Amino acid sequence: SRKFFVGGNWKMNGSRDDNDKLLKLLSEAHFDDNTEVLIAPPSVFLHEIRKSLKKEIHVAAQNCYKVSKGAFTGEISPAMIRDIGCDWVILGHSERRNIFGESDELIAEKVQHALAEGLSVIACIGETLSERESNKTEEVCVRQLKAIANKIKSADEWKRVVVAYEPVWAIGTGKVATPQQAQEVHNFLRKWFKTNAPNGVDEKIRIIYGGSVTAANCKELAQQHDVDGFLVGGASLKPEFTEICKARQR
Amino acid sequence: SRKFFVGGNWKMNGSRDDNDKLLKLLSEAHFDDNTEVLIAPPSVFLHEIRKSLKKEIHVAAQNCYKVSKGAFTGEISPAMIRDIGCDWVILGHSERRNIFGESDELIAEKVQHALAEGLSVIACIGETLSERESNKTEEVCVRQLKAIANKIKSADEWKRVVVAYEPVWAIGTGKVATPQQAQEVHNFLRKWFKTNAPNGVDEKIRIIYGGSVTAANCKELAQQHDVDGFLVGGASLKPEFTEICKARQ
Ligand SMILES: [Cl-]
Ligand SMILES: [Cl-]
Ligand code: NA
Ligand code: NA
Ligand code: NA
């Protein structure tokens, strides 16, 4: 059975005093062996947070670039992420795709490079409100996923990928996908893997939901057949995050 | 008189081992009191490098965004840069403009925000080979500078700005600008500041040159009347960086 997976995307939020309070709450929570837990702080805090935080909790960069070093002022590399002792990265987040213009191919290139360095990847996909209204949800999701899958050449590589489906219109808007909306997307996503990725990957790959997940709505979403966890944004800065990590419990 | 200013832009280069060997040579060197020195490591190394390095050497983030917090996955804010104890940021670098498509206006919004947060800012401008060959150098530099100046409303803000002129065709190409080409742009920029910034900014603002600066070419550039220093890229990873910092001598 796929291990349940809850990541917390802090986005552009953090400071020594705020981080210390949040990490104190995280360290004191008790997470069962059945739940895999990840936080993603801003890049300037990654090294110190990884040093102090227990190793059962992942510490991810929120973005990285697609080569180990070079003339890319402002960018960090998977080698740099490994050098500071972190093992994960979020790639293709909608804010990077939309506000910063990162293309499908750029995300695919980043994912392939991160996997080549030994990282695990949360690879983000999703459709806008207008794309959904035009009944393009699957077309858009499958385009973004296919670009990434085209650079993943073996089934072993897919073991270090978690797919996050986040409808753009649910991100930070308070407007979560209904449990039926989420299950329906994740189901055709898993079917796409069954058809298009190496045998067996469909049954192992975690597909997590993101977009206005809170403690008030996380339990019904977690009971959905093809939902394997969450990418939590605004709520990952609050005490209720530890409650969202228990989403599968009664 | 304006203090000589030398910055090292590491770009996307850095690791605990490589950083340690670099900072040792840098922490052992001796610079005269009229030289201001700055390094700019990748964001993941900023905090620990700032903690261990003598305060007189600045440590700059290589980029930041234009508000203090929000839903901008992968970005960092002036407030975070200050929280980890750094007081500088490079904004508007050629690589952000020409690889990541940062517009003049986005750059100007960033500078205004970093300045309002109390940071000091290296603001980069410069023209392409095509632009230079169309005799568009001054028009391009002014367009870029003017977007920033529009958001800056005080000599006090301009006090914490260092302008880096970096011809795009000189960055990483081995084609440095001659002392004469550099001086010609720097003199024109200082003239533009006299009319387009509050009184006295032109006399104060450091205009530093960037683009294939090496220990082999820096002294002649440093002698030009309006060149106040250097933004150094590839050579800033090498021991000869400390020589470039001594270019006025
Ligand atoms: Cl980790
Ligand atoms: Cl500093
Ligand atoms: Na640790
Ligand atoms: Na198959
Ligand atoms: Na004036």
Residue numbers in the entry:
A (entry chain A): 4 to 253
B (entry chain B): 4 to 252
Direct quotes from the study:
Helminth parasites are causal agents of diseases prevalent in humans. or TIM-barrel fold composed of 8 alternate β-strand and α-helices. three invariable catalytic residues (Lys, His, and Glu). enzymatic activity, leading to the concept that TPIs are obligated dimers.
helminths, we solved the crystal structures of TPIs from T. 2-PGA at 2.1 and 2.3 Å, respectively. in the presence of 2-PGA (TsTPI and SmTPI) and in its absence (OvTPI). and TsTPI exhibit a Tm of 75 and 57 ºC, respectively. interactions in SmTPI correlates with its higher melting point. illustrates the positions of residues TsTPI-S213 and SmTPI-S215. stabilize the SXD/E insert in SmTPI and TsTPI. TsTPI and SmTPI harbor 6 cysteine residues in their primary sequence. whereas only one thiol group is accessible in SmTPI at position C221. inhibited by targeting its solvent accessible cysteine.
